[PDB]
Design a protein around this ligand. Structure first.
Ligand code: CLA
Ligand code: CLA
Ligand code: CLA
Ligand code: CLA
Ligand code: CLA
Ligand code: CLA
Ligand code: CLA
Ligand SMILES: CCCCCCCCCCCCCCCC(=O)OC[C@H](COP(=O)(O)OC[C@@H](O)CO)OC(=O)CCCCCCCCCCCCCCC
Ligand SMILES: CC1=C(/C=C/C(C)=C/C=C/C(C)=C/C=C/C=C(C)/C=C/C=C(C)/C=C/C2=C(C)CCCC2(C)C)C(C)(C)CCC1
Ligand SMILES: CC1=C(C/C=C(\C)CCC[C@H](C)CCC[C@H](C)CCCC(C)C)C(=O)c2ccccc2C1=O
Ligand SMILES: CC1=C(C/C=C(\C)CCC[C@H](C)CCC[C@H](C)CCCC(C)C)C(=O)c2ccccc2C1=O
Ligand code: SF4
Lengths: 73, 80, 159, 73, 742, 73, 62, 141
C-alpha cells in the first residue's frame, strides 16, 4: 500500500511538472517564425477546439458520475 | 522602478494622467491623433503599480502599459 | 448468463431481498389498527413493493451474487431495454431542446434589441419554434448538407 | 469498479483540461493578448477590464495541482 | 413641533416600472449588454440609498419594506399554526407528552420517500419536528385543533393587512422626512406602547387563561374535560376554585393591599417538579412587573406637551477631560443616516439573541421542554447562529456608514474623531491580545496532546495533573446557590438549577437539570471562546476603522465600500476594502459559533442529561467523559466527532434518512465553496472564451455576452456556499444524533 | 489561511504592527534591517499550495499506514 | 480611407473585435493621423467601450 | 519656471494622531505640502481625523508622496485651492516635485519632452524568445 501510494503521488506531481515546463517553453522559448506552419504551430492555431472538447468531456463525465452516485445514494 | 510605456495609439484622452495618484504621467505635445497631445511617463521612479492608468485608457486593447519590475521603497508604498 | 450473472427470476438472493423488506414492513404495520391511515399507507407500500419485485423478474434483468440487478450496457439485443432504448428517446428530447433553443437564438439575433429579447422572451415566436422543433433531425441534417450549420469567420484572436 | 474508473477518468480529464488551457493560453488570450511579455508567474493585470485576477499560466498550474491531488486521492 | 406629516399620493401605482426589469438605478436601466447585469441587478436591488440621494424617498422605501417583511412573517406564523392544526399529532401528544414525539409535517407518498413518515406515536406518521411549538401551545393553554385553525386564519388576515399598509403608506399616504426624524416620540411609543402594553396584555392572557388550564393539566385531568378558556372569564367562581384569591375581586389591586395576590403572583425559583419548566404563576408576575417598568420608562423624552427630556441636551452634557468634546454631534448622526442606526440595532439584537439562547436552556420556560433534548438543543443552536450573523451585519453596516455617510466638516466633535485618530493603537493592542489568547488557549491543548502522545499523562493539564480550576465561576455559582437565604429572602429558591445549589429534578425518567460542575476542561474552552470572539472583533473593528483610509491607500473612501483591490501594486492590495473585512470575519464568526455549539452539545450530553432509574442512580448519555477526554484534540476527534457521528451515517433505510442524505449534501456544498474561494476571475474568463468559440462555430452565440463573475461576487458565492455547507452539516449531525439518542 | 485571505489585509495589519513596535520604550533599542511586508500574491498562493499538499500527503500516509499495519490486512 | 456607413471587418490581431464587423462613423482626413478610421461595434469589450479607431490598412473586408 | 521656495509658514490646527511620521522620515525622504486659503474651513486629513486649515498660508508635512497628491486633489476639487509639495532629505535638501513647470500634468504645455513613448502599436512587440541571452526585454526597443 505504501509503495503504490508513494509512486502514484510521485507520478501525479511529475505529470503536473511536465505540463508546467511545456507552458514555460511556450512562453519563453517558442519562436513563431522558425516554427512556421509545422504541427507545433497548428496546435496553437486551433487550441479553442481542443479546450472546448476537453471541457465537454470533463463536464459529461462529472455530470453523469455524480448523477449515478447520488441516485444510488 | 516599474516600466511604463505609451504606445502611439493614445487619442489624448488625458484620463491616464488624471487617474495616476503619484504625478507620474503628464501630457506632452505630439501631433498625430486629433489634438497633438500624447501621454508621457518621466517619473516612473514613483509608480507603485496602481494600474489605475490602464483602467482608464479607452483604446482597443491599451495604449499605456505598466510592467512590474524591481521593487523599491517608493514603489512598495511603504510609510514606515 | 453474460458476465456470470443469473436472471433475476431465478436468483435465490432476490427472494431474501424481497422477504426481508416485506417482513420489515409488516413489523412496522403491526403497531396500528387495520382501519387507520398508517395501516392503509403501509399496505399500499407493501403492494407497491410486490408490484415492483414482480416486474424485474419478468423483464429479464440479470441479478448479482448479492441479489441486485445489473445493467448490461453493451448493445446486447436481449438487453436493449436498459441503455439503448431509453438512450434513443433521451437523445431525441435533448436534440429537440437544443435545436429549438438554437433556432430561437438565430431568429432573435436579427431584431432591433436582441439583448432585450433574451431577458424578456416573446412567447408567440418561442412557442412557434418549440412546435416546429418536432422534426429536428430531418432539419439538422438538412442544414448540415446545405452548408448552413457552421460559420467560418469566427472572432477568436490570440497575439 | 465501473463508477470509480469513471471518476478517475473525470479527474484525469479535468486535470489535463486545466494544464492544457494554461499551456496554450500562456502566450496570450483575448483578455490579455500580450501575456508573453509579462512572463510565466505574475499576480494579475489589475482590477480593470472586469477583473483579471489569477490569470497567468503559473496560476493554471497552481489550480491544476489541486485536481491532481484529488485524482490521486 | 411633533405632528403628523403625509404627502398625498406621491407615487402612482402601475405596471410600467414593473415591465422594465432594471428601473431603480439609471446605470443599468438601459439593458443587459453583458451577463454581469443580471447579477448586479439583484446585488443592488435593495440598495435604497444608492438609487437616489434624498432621505425622504429612502425612508418611505424602508417603511414599506418593513411592512412587506412583517407580512411575510405573518404568513410564516399562520402556516406553522395551520400545520399544527391539520397535520399534527397535537391532541394525542397532550394525553401523553412523555411518550409521544412531536410531529407536524407529513410527506406525500410518491417515490419511496413515504418512509420519512416515521412512527412518532399516537397513531400518527410524520417527520418529528423540533421547533418547540407543541410546548409553546401547551404553555399558552391551547388544547384543541380548533383553537389552532382560527388563529391560522387570524394570521392570514394580518398578513393581508400588513400588505395593505405597505402599499398605502407608499402610494396613497406616504410620510415625509420630517416625520421619521421624531425619535423622541418614536422611543416613547415603542417603550410605553409596544413593549409595555404588549407585556401587560400577555400578562393578562396568562393570569386569566394560561394559569387555570395549565394547572388543571398538571392535576392530571383529561385535556378534553378542561373547561374552555372563556369559562374562566365569565365565571370568577370556576376560576377561584384553583386560585381563591380571585374571590377577592379587583379590590386588592386598587387599595394597594395586593399582597393577597400571592396565589397566582408568586416569586419561586426552580422548576415545576412535574413539567420540568418554570412556574407560570411566576411568569405572570414577571410580565406584570415588566409591563409597568416599560410603561413608566416610556415617559422620559420630550414631546409637544412641555415636559420630558431631549436627546441632545442629554448627549452634549457628557463631555469629560479625556474625551474631547464629548457626545456632541451624535444626535445629528443617528437622525440623518439609516446605517448608523442599523449598526447599533443589529449589534444589540444579536447580543440579545445570544442572551436568549443562554437563558432558555438554563431556565426552561415551557412545560416538558427540558425533557425533549432535541428541541432544547435546536433552540440553542439556531438562536446562536442568528446572533452570530446579526453581529457581523452590525459591523458591516457600521463600515458602510463610515465609508459613505461620515463627513468631518461637522464631525470635529472629538468622540468619533478621537477613536479614529488612534486606530493604529487600538488595532495593535487588539492584535497583541489576540495573539496572547490564541497561544495561551490552543498551545495548552497542543501540550496535552503531545503529552498524552508521549506516554506521559502526568505532565498534562488535566484535572488530575496540573489543575486550572476556574475559581471565579465557581464562586459565582456558590453565591447564586445561597441567594434565597441571604441576598433574596423572599425568593423561595435559586433562579436556576444550574447553580451548584439545589438538587435534581425528574420528568418521568430522563433528567431535566442539575448543578453543573466546572473544571479545567471548562477553563480551557472558555478561554478558547474568548480568543475566537477577540479575533472576530479584531477583523471587524479593523475593517470599520480603516474603512476610510490607511497608510497603504490614503484615498480609499473615494474608491467606495465595495471594491476588489487597488491594483497589484504596492506589493499587492487585494482584499483591502471593508466589505472584504466582513467577508473575512464571517468565517471567524462561523468558527466561534461552531465551537460554542460543540461545547454545549458535548457538555450537556455528558454532565447534564441522562435517564435516572429508581434508587436515584443517574447515568448520563455519554457517561461523564467530558471532564477527562475534552482536554486533547484527539478527544474531540474520536469521543465527539467519530463517536457521536455514528448515528447519522448508518441512518439509511430508517425514518432518519434525510439527515444522512443532507450530511453528504452539505459536505458537497462546503467542498464546492472551495472552487470559488481559491480560484480567480481571470482563469475562468479566459476559459469561457474557448466555449464561446465552440458556440460561434455553430451559430449559438448568445447576445448577452457571457462574462465571468466579478472579483467580489466570487468571494460572496464562496463564503455563502461555505457557510451553508458547514451549518447544514452540523444541523444534520446534531439532529440525527439527538433525535435517536435523546 | 493563505488561500482565502489576501494581501491587502495583512499589509495594512503589518503597517500598524510596525508602529506599535516603534512607539514602545525598552523595545526600540532593537531595530529591523529588512522592512517587514506581507507575503506577495504568487508567494501566498505558493505557500498555501505547499501547506495544502503537505497536509494532504501526511494525513493520508498516517491513515494508510496505521489502519493497515494496525491490522495487517 | 473607406466610405462612411461602410461595413468593414477588423484585422487588428490584438483587437477584441478581431474578425468582427462594424460600420464606419467618420474617417478623419488630416495629413498626419496614424489611425483615422472610426468604427463603432454592436458588442462592448471587457472594458465596456464599443467605438475604436484603426488605420485604413488595418481593416477591410466589405 | 523657477520652482517655488519653501518658507516657515504656519501649520494647520490638529490635536494629534497616530498616523503621522515615522523613523523613515529621519533616515530617508519625507514630503511637505503647502497651499493658500481665503478663510478657515474644516478639511479631512489623509492620515485620519479632521483639521482646521488657517487663513492665508499653510504648510503640512506627511510621510509619503501619495498622501500629498491625495490631499491636493481633494483640495483642488472641493475647495478650489492650488498647491505644491516638495520632498525633503535627511540632510535638508528640498526638492520640488508636483507642479514641476507650473501647469498640472493634465493640461498640455510647451517645453515638455516625451518619455517612454513607443512609435508602434502595442500588439507589435517581438516575442520574448528571440531576445534571449540579450537583456533587452520586449518593449524597451
Ligand atoms: C526533473 C525535475 C525538475 C527540474 C529539473 C525542474 C527545474 C526547474 N523548475 Mg520545475 N517542476 C517540476 C520538476 C522539475 N523542475 C515538477 C515535478 C513540478 C510540478 C510541481 C514543477 C513545477 C515548477 C514551477 C511551477 C516552476 C518550476 C520552475 C523551475 C525552474 C526554476 C526552479 C526554481 O525557481 O527553483 C527550473 C528550471 C520555475 C520556473 O522555471 O520559472 C520560470 C517555476 O515557476 N517548476
Ligand atoms: C467538491 C468540490 C468541487 C466540485 C464539485 C467542482 C466541480 C467542477 N470543477 Mg472544480 N475545483 C474545486 C472544487 C470543486 N470543483 C477546487 C477546490 C479547485 C481548486 C481551486 C477547483 C478548480 C477547478 C478548475 C481549475 C477547473 C474546475 C472545473 C470544474 C468543473 C468540471 C466539470 C465537471 O466535473 O462537471 C465542475 C463544475 C473545470 C471546469 O470549468 O470545467 C469546464 C476547471 O477548469 N475546477
Ligand atoms: C397592488 C399592487 C402593486 C403595484 C401595481 C405596485 C407598483 C409599483 N411599486 Mg409597489 N408595493 C406594493 C404593491 C404594488 N406596487 C405593496 C403591497 C408594497 C408593500 C410591500 C409595495 C412597496 C413598494 C416599494 C417600497 C417600492 C414600490 C415600487 C413600485 C413601482 C415599481 C415596482 C417594480 O417594478 O418592482 C417590482 C418588484 C417585484 C415584482 C418584487 C416583488 C417581491 C415581493 C415584494 C416580495 C416577495 C418575497 C417572497 C416571500 C419571496 C421570498 C424569497 C423566496 C424566493 C423564497 C411600481 C409603480 C418602487 C418605486 O416606485 O420606486 C421607484 C419602490 O421603491 N412598491
Ligand atoms: C412558511 C409557510 C409554509 C410552508 C413552508 C408550507 C409548506 C408546505 N405546505 Mg403549507 N400552508 C401554509 C404555509 C406554509 N406551507 C399556509 C399559510 C396555509 C394555509 C393557507 C397552508 C396550507 C397547506 C395545505 C392545505 C397543505 C399544505 C401543504 C404543504 C406541503 C406541500 C406543499 C406543496 O408541495 O405545494 C409543504 C411542506 C400540503 C401538505 O403538507 O400535504 C400533506 C397540504 O395539503 N399547506
Ligand atoms: C437616570 C435616570 C434619570 C435622571 C438622572 C433624570 C434626571 C432629570 N429628569 Mg428625568 N426621567 C427619567 C429618568 C431620569 N431623569 C425617566 C425614566 C422618566 C420617565 C423621566 C421623565 C422626566 C420628565 C417628564 C422630566 C424629567 C426631568 C428631569 C430633570 C429634572 C429633575 C430633577 O432634578 O428634579 C433631571 C435632569 C424634568 C426636566 O425638565 O428635564 C429636562 C422633566 O420635566 N424627567
Ligand atoms: C436587519 C438586517 C439587514 C438589513 C436590513 C440589511 C440591508 C442591507 N444590506 Mg446587509 N447584512 C446583514 C443584515 C441586514 N442587511 C447581515 C446580518 C450581514 C452579515 C452577513 C449583512 C451583510 C451585508 C453585506 C456584506 C452587504 C450588505 C448590503 C446591504 C444593503 C443591500 C442589500 C441587498 O441588496 O441585498 C440583496 C439580497 C441578495 C442579493 C440576496 C443574496 C442571497 C443570500 C446571500 C443567500 C441566502 C441563503 C438562504 C438563507 C438559504 C440558501 C438556500 C436557498 C437559496 C436555496 C442593504 C441596505 C450590501 C451593501 O452594499 O449595502 C449598502 C453589502 O455589500 N449587507
Ligand atoms: C488551522 C488553521 C489556521 C490557523 C492555525 C490560523 C492561525 C492564526 N490566524 Mg487564521 N485563518 C485561517 C486558518 C488558520 N489561522 C483561515 C482558513 C482563514 C480564512 C478565513 C483565516 C483568517 C484569519 C484572519 C482574518 C486573521 C487570522 C489570524 C490568525 C492568528 C491569530 C493569532 C493567534 O491565535 O496566534 C496563535 C497561533 C497559533 C495557535 C498557531 C499554532 C502555534 C503553535 C501552537 C506553537 C508552535 C511552537 C513552536 C513555535 C514551533 C516551532 C517549530 C520549529 C521548531 C520548527 C493565527 C496566527 C488573525 C491575526 O493575524 O491575528 C494576529 C487575523 O486577523 N486568520
Ligand atoms: C477604562 C478607562 C476609563 O475609565 O475611561 C474613562 C475615560 C472617559 O473620561 P471622560 O470623563 O473624558 O469621559 C466621559 C465623557 O467625556 C464621555 O466619555 O475614558 C478614557 O479616558 C478613554 C478610555 C480608553 C481606555 C483605554 C483602555
Ligand atoms: C493497448 C495495447 C497496446 C498499445 C498501447 C499503446 C499504443 C499505448 C499508447 C499510449 C500513449 C499514446 C500514451 C501517451 C501519453 C501522453 C502523454 C503523457 C502526453 C503528455 C504531453 C505533454 C506533457 C506535453 C507537453 C508539451 C507541451 C504542452 C508544449 C510543448 C511541448 C511539450 C511536449 C513539452 C500494446 C499493443 C502495446 C500492447 C497490447 C495492448
Ligand atoms: C466557476 C467560477 C466562475 C465562473 C462561473 C460562473 C459563470 C457561474 C455561472 C453558472 C450559471 C449556472 C449559469 C446560468 C444558467 C442560466 C440561469 C440558464 C437557465 C436555464 C437552465 C440551465 C436552468 C467565476 O466567474 C469566478 C470568478 C471569481 C472567482 C471564482 C470564480 C469561479 O470559481
Ligand atoms: C498570514 C498571511 C500573511 C502574513 C504572514 C507572514 C508575514 C509570514 C511570516 C510568518 C513567520 C514570520 C515565519 C514562519 C516560519 C515558518 C515555520 C518557516 C519559514 C520558512 C523556512 C524557509 C525557514 C500574508 O502576508 C498574506 C499575504 C497574502 C495572502 C495571505 C497572507 C496570509 O495569510
Ligand atoms: S485581486 Fe485583482 S487586483 Fe487585487 S491583486 Fe489579484 S488581481 Fe490585482
Amino acid at each position: 500500500a505504501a509503495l503504490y501510494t508513494h509512486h502514484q503521488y510521485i507520478a501525479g506531481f511529475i505529470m503536473t511538472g511536465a505540463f508546467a515546463h511545456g507552458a514555460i517553453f511556450f512562453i519563453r522559448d517558442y519562436n513563431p517564425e522558425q516554427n512556421k506552419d509545422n504541427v507545433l504551430a497548428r496546435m496553437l492555431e486551433h487550441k479553442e477546439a481542443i479546450i472546448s472538447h476537453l471541457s465537454w468531456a470533463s463536464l459529461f463525465l462529472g455530470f453523469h458520475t455524480l448523477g449515478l452516485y447520488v441516485h444510488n445514494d | 522602478a516599474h516600466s511604463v510605456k505609451i504606445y502611439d495609439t493614445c487619442i489624448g484622452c488625458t484620463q491616464c494622467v488624471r487617474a495616476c495618484p503619484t504625478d507620474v504621467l503628464e501630457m506632452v505635445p505630439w501631433d498625430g491623433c486629433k489634438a497633438s497631445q500624447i501621454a508621457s511617463a518621466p517619473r516612473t521612479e514613483d509608480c507603485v503599480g496602481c494600474k489605475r492608468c490602464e483602467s482608464a485608457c479607452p483604446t482597443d486593447f491599451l495604449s499605456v502599459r505598466v510592467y512590474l519590475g524591481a521593487e523599491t521603497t517608493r514603489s512598495m508604498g511603504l510609510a514606515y | 448468463d453474460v458476465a456470470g450473472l443469473t436472471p433475476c427470476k431465478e436468483s435465490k438472493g432476490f427472494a431474501k431481498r424481497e422477504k426481508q423488506e416485506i417482513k420489515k414492513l409488516e413489523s412496522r404495520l403491526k403497531l396500528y389498527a387495520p382501519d387507520s391511515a398508517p395501516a392503509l399507507a403501509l399496505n399500499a407500500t407493501i403492494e407497491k413493493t410486490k408490484r415492483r419485485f414482480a416486474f424485474y423478474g419478468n423483464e429479464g434483468l440479470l441479478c448479482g451474487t448479492d441479489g441486485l440487478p445489473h445493467l448490461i450496457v453493451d448493445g446486447d439485443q436481449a438487453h436493449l431495454g436498459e441503455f439503448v432504448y431509453p438512450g434513443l428517446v433521451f437523445l431525441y428530447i435533448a436534440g429537440w431542446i437544443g435545436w429549438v433553443g438554437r433556432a430561437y437564438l438565430i431568429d432573435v439575433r436579427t431584431s432591433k434589441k436582441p439583448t432585450e429579447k433574451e431577458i424578456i422572451i416573446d412567447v408567440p415566436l418561442a412557442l412557434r419554434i418549440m412546435s416546429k422543433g418536432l422534426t429536428w433531425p430531418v432539419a439538422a441534417i438538412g442544414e448540415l448538407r446545405s452548408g448552413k450549420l457552421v460559420e467560418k469567420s469566427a472572432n477568436i484572436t490570440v497575439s | 469498479d465501473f463508477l470509480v474508473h469513471h471518476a478517475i477518468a473525470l479527474g484525469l480529464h479535468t486535470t489535463t483540461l486545466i494544464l492544457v488551457k494554461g499551456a496554450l493560453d500562456a502566450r496570450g488570450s483575448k483578455l490579455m493578448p500580450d501575456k508573453k511579455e509579462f512572463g510565466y508567474s505574475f499576480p494579475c493585470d489589475g482590477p480593470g477590464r472586469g477583473g483579471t485576477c489569477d490569470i497567468s499560466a503559473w496560476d493554471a498550474f497552481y489550480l491544476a495541482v489541486f485536481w491532481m491531488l484529488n485524482t490521486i486521492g | 413641533e411633533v405632528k403628523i406629516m403625509v404627502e398625498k399620493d406621491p407615487v402612482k401605482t402601475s405596471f410600467e416600472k414593473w415591465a422594465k426589469p432594471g428601473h431603480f438605478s439609471r446605470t443599468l436601466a438601459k439593458g443587459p449588454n453583458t451577463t454581469t447585469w443580471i447579477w448586479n441587478l439583484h446585488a443592488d436591488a435593495h440598495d435604497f440609498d444608492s438609487h437616489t440621494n434624498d432621505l425622504e424617498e429612502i425612508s418611505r422605501k424602508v417603511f414599506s419594506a418593513h411592512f412587506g417583511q412583517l407580512a411575510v412573517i405573518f404568513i410564516w406564523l399562520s402556516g406553522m399554526y395551520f400545520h399544527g392544526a391539520r397535520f399534527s399529532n397535537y391532541e394525542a401528544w397532550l394525553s401523553d407528552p412523555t411518550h409521544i414525539k412531536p410531529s407536524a409535517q407529513v410527506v406525500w407518498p410518491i417515490v419511496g420517500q413515504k418512509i420519512l413518515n416515521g412512527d412518532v406515536g399516537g397513531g400518527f406518521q410524520g417527520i418529528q419536528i423540533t421547533s418547540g411549538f407543541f410546548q409553546l401551545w401547551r404553555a399558552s393553554g391551547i388544547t384543541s385543533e380548533l383553537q389552532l385553525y382560527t388563529t391560522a386564519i387570524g394570521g392570514l388576515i394580518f398578513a393581508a393587512l400588513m400588505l395593505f399598509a405597505g402599499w398605502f403608506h407608499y402610494h396613497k399616504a406616504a410620510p415625509k422626512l420630517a416625520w421619521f426624524q421624531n425619535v423622541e416620540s418614536m422611543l416613547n411609543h415603542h417603550l410605553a406602547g409596544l413593549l409595555g402594553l404588549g407585556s401587560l396584555a400577555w400578562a393578562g392572557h396568562q393570569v386569566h387563561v394560561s394559569l387555570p388550564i395549565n394547572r388543571l393539566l398538571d392535576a392530571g385531568v383529561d385535556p378534553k374535560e378542561i373547561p374552555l378558556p372563556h369559562e374562566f372569564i365569565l365565571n370568577r367562581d370556576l376560576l377561584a376554585q384553583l386560585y381563591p384569591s380571585f374571590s377577592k375581586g379587583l379590590t386588592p389591586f386598587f387599595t394597594l393591599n395586593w399582597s393577597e395576590y400571592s396565589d397566582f403572583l408568586t416569586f419561586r425559583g426552580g422548576l415545576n417538579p412535574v413539567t420540568g419548566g418554570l412556574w407560570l404563576t411566576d411568569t405572570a408576575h414577571h410580565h406584570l412587573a415588566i409591563a409597568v417598568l416599560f410603561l413608566v420608562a416610556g415617559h422620559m423624552y420630550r414631546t409637544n406637551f412641555g415636559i420630558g427630556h431631549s436627546m441632545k441636551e442629554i448627549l452634549e452634557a457628557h463631555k469629560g477631560p479625556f474625551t474631547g468634546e464629548g457626545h456632541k454631534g451624535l444626535y445629528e448622526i443617528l437622525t440623518t443616516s439609516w446605517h448608523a442606526q442599523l449598526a447599533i440595532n443589529l449589534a444589540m439584537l444579536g447580543s440579545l439573541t445570544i442572551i436568549v439562547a443562554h437563558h432558555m436552556y438554563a431556565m426552561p420556560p415551557y412545560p416538558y421542554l427540558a425533557t425533549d433534548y432535541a428541541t432544547q438543543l435546536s433552540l440553542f443552536t439556531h438562536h446562536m447562529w442568528i446572533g452570530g450573523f446579526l453581529v457581523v451585519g452590525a459591523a458591516a453596516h457600521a463600515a458602510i456608514f463610515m465609508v459613505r455617510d461620515y463627513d468631518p466638516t461637522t464631525q470635529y466633535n472629538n468622540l468619533l474623531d478621537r477613536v479614529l485618530r488612534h486606530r493604529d493603537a487600538i488595532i495593535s493592542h487588539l492584535n497583541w491580545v489576540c495573539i496572547f489568547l490564541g497561544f495561551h488557549s490552543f498551545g495548552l491543548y497542543i501540550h496535552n496532546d503531545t503529552m498524552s502522545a508521549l506516554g506521559r499523562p502526568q505532565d498534562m493539564f488535566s484535572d488530575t495533573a496540573i489543575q486550572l480550576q476556574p475559581v471565579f465561576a465557581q464562586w459565582i455559582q456558590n453565591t447564586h446557590a445561597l441567594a434565597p437565604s441571604l441576598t433574596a429572602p423572599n425568593a423561595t429558591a435559586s433562579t436556576s438549577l444550574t447553580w451548584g445549589g439545589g438538587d435534581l429534578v425528574a420528568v418521568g425518567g430522563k433528567v431535566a437539570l442539575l448543578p453543573i460542575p466546572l473544571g479545567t476542561a471548562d477553563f480551557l474552552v472558555h478561554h478558547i471562546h474568548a480568543f475566537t470572539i477577540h479575533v472576530t472583533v479584531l477583523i471587524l473593528l479593523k475593517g470599520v476603522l480603516f474603512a476610510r483610509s490607511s497608510r497603504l491607500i490614503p484615498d480609499k473612501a473615494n474608491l467606495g465600500f465595495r471594491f476588489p483591490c487597488d491594483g497589484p501594486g504596492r506589493g499587492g492590495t487585494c482584499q483591502v476594502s471593508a466589505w472584504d473585512h466582513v467577508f473575512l470575519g464571517l468565517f471567524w464568526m462561523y468558527n466561534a459559533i461552531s465551537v460554542v455549539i460543540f461545547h454545549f452539545s458535548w457538555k450537556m450530553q455528558s454532565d447534564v442529561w441522562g435517564s435516572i432509574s429508581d434508587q436515584g442512580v443517574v447515568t448520563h448519555i455519554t457517561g461523564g467523559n467530558f471532564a477527562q477526554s475534552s482536554i486533547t484534540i484527539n478527544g474531540w476527534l474520536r469521543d465527539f466527532l467519530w463517536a457521536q457521528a455514528s448515528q447519522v451515517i448508518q441512518s439509511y433505510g430508517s425514518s432518519l434518512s434525510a439527515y444522512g442524505l443532507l450530511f453528504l449534501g452539505a459536505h458537497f456544498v462546503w467542498a464546492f465553496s472551495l472552487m470559488f474561494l481559491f480560484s480567480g476571475r481571470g482563469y475562468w474568463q479566459e476559459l469561457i472564451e474557448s466555449i464561446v468559440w465552440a458556440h460561434n462555430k455553430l451559430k449559438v452565440a448568445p447576445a448577452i455576452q457571457p462574462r465571468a463573475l466579478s472579483i467580489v461576487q466570487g468571494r460572496a458565492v464562496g463564503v455563502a456556499h461555505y457557510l451553508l455547507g458547514g451549518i447544514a452539516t452540523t444541523w444534520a449531525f446534531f439532529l440525527a444524533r439527538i433525535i435517536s439518542v435523546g | 489561511m493563505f488561500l482565502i485571505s489576501w494581501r491587502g489585509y495583512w499589509q495594512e495589519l503589518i503597517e500598524t504592527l510596525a508602529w506599535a513596535h516603534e512607539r514602545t520604550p525598552l523595545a526600540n533599542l532593537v531595530r529591523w534591517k529588512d522592512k517587514p511586508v506581507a507575503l506577495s500574491i504568487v508567494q501566498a498562493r505558493l505557500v498555501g499550495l505547499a501547506h495544502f499538499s503537505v497536509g494532504y500527503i501526511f494525513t493520508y500516509a498516517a491513515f494508510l499506514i496505521a489502519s493497515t499495519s494496525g491490522k495487517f490486512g | 480611407g473607406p466610405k462612411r456607413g461602410s461595413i468593414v471587418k477588423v484585422l487588428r490581431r490584438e483587437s477584441y473585435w478581431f474578425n468582427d464587423t462594424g460600420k464606419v462613423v467618420a474617417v478623419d482626413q488630416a495629413p498626419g493621423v496614424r489611425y483615422p478610421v472610426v468604427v463603432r461595434f454592436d458588442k462592448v469589450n471587457y472594458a465596456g467601450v464599443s467605438t475604436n479607431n484603426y488605420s485604413p490598412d488595418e481593416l477591410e473586408a466589405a | 519656471t523657477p520652482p517655488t521656495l519653501n518658507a516657515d509658514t504656519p501649520a494647520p490646527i490638529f490635536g494629534g494622531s497616530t498616523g503621522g511620521l515615522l523613523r523613515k522620515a529621519q533616515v530617508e525622504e519625507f514630503y511637505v505640502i503647502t497651499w493658500e486659503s481665503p478663510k478657515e474651513q474644516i478639511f479631512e486629513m489623509p492620515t485620519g481625523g479632521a483639521a482646521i486649515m488657517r487663513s492665508g498660508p499653510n504648510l503640512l508635512k506627511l510621510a509619503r508622496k501619495e498622501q500629498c497628491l491625495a490631499l491636493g486633489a481633494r483640495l483642488r476639487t472641493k475647495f478650489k485651492i492650488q498647491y505644491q509639495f516638495y520632498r525633503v532629505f535627511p540632510n535638508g535638501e528640498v526638492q520640488y516635485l508636483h507642479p514641476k513647470d507650473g501647469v498640472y500634468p493634465e493640461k498640455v504645455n510647451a517645453g515638455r519632452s516625451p518619455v517612454g513613448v513607443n512609435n508602434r502599436s502595442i500588439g507589435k512587440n517581438a516575442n520574448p524568445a528571440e531576445l534571449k541571452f540579450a537583456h533587452k526585454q520586449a518593449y524597451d526597443l
